[PDB]
């Protein structure tokens, strides 16, 4: 599923990302845009045998288990397949665990490069929230 921008913002707000550990909703919508263009089914294969899954492109080496990635840690204790649903529940739960590390949202390279301290609010204003 490819979320509309505002549709995703409302969904992320419902899933409690707005102000989660000090991160306003704008940051998450922006991150999603640059990571997968709001596409829940996005997948990216890496050189180390790992794959990124979902709206927020979470790594299978560190965060989820896809049963075929060497050195898997599965920090989010979840099947990577769950990160490819039209239901963002799993992706949000895992994103929250990731952002709870000292690295914060710096975990997402695309976020640091195109979202990190900019007017991320620009991604949410205009919407019905």
């Amino acid at each position, epitope marked *: 599923k490819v979320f509309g921008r505002c549709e995703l913002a409302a969904a992320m707000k*419902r*899933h*409690g*990302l707005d*102000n989660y550990r000090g991160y306003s909703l704008g940051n998450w919508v922006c991150a999603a845009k640059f990571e997968s263009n709001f596409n829940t089914q996005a997948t990216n294969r890496n050189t180390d045998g790992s794959t990124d899954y979902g709206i927020l492109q979470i790594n299978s080496r560190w965060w989820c288990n896809d049963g075929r990635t060497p050195g898997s840690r599965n*920090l989010c204790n979840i099947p990577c397949s769950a990160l490819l649903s039209s239901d963002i*529940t799993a992706s949000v739960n895992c994103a929250k*665990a990731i952002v709870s*590390d*000292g690295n914060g949202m710096n975990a997402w390279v695309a976020w640091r490069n195109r979202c990190k301290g900019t007017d991320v609010q620009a991604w949410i204003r205009g919407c019905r929230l």
Partner: antibody
Framework: EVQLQESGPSLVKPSQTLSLTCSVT????????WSWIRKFPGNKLEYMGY???????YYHPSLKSRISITRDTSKNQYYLQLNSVTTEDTATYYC???????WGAGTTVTVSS | DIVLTQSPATLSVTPGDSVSLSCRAS??????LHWYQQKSHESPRLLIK???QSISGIPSRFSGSGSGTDFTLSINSVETEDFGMYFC?????????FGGGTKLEIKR
């Protein structure tokens, strides 16, 4: 198959250091974030802090700085250190996964001279 | 910092009754509220995560609802093994904090 178990002295004298060990079995000490929670005699609960994958730690402001959380990847255990304790640090200490899905049985630590 | 207020402090019911436990936050925490059960001093057990998410392996009679500052833990048809303490915990902001807890007791 993850299981946790707290261990350490049950008695600490005022002003001294409280030390506890949490043994992780079933999975590595680096396959999740790890926390320490305490339950006072009155039943109130306090989330002392946790250590995440990067080694970064988060400590409850109330503990000032008396607290340290560390881990040993070789033994697959993580520890809790609480300095300059007082009678008020008497409580039941639990180690648990940051996900809250796994908790140790808990161990009582009494502070008295 | 965030203060979680639970009520009632104690509830006395007969097995078969349904109950609803309240937890209110001093600041909005969206859906970052979790519910725990503990029969004594014995280890807490996560029942509901993120306000309403079910956890595989937890009896279906347990359910949670709410968002922002008002949350509710519902137990439909309390079973004899359900008596004990219930606590809510927020993970929206550090430090994580727990509510004062509600004691579920047997009525006679």
């Amino acid at each position: 198959e993850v299981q946790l178990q707290e261990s350490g002295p049950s008695l600490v004298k005022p002003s001294q250091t409280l030390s506890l060990t949490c043994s992780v079995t079933g999975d590595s000490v680096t396959s999740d974030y790890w926390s320490w929670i305490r339950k006072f005699p009155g039943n109130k609960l306090e989330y002392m802090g946790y250590i995440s994958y990067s080694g970064s730690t988060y400590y409850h402001p109330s503990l000032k700085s008396r607290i340290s959380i560390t881990r040993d990847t070789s033994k697959n255990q993580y520890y809790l250190q609480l300095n300059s304790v007082t009678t008020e640090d008497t409580a039941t200490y639990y180690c648990a996964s940051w996900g809250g899905d796994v908790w140790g049985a808990g161990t009582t630590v009494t502070v008295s001279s | 910092d965030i203060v979680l207020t639970q009520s009632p402090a104690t509830l006395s019911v007969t097995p078969g009754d349904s109950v609803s436990l309240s937890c209110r936050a001093s600041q909005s925490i969206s859906n970052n509220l979790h519910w725990y059960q503990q029969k004594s001093h014995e280890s807490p057990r996560l029942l509901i995560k993120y306000a309403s998410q079910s956890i595989s392996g937890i009896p279906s009679r347990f359910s949670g609802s709410g968002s922002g500052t008002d949350f509710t833990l519902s137990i439909n048809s309390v079973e004899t093994e359900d008596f004990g303490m219930y606590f809510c915990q927020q993970s929206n902001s550090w430090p994580y904090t727990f509510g004062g807890g509600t004691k579920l007791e047997i009525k006679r």
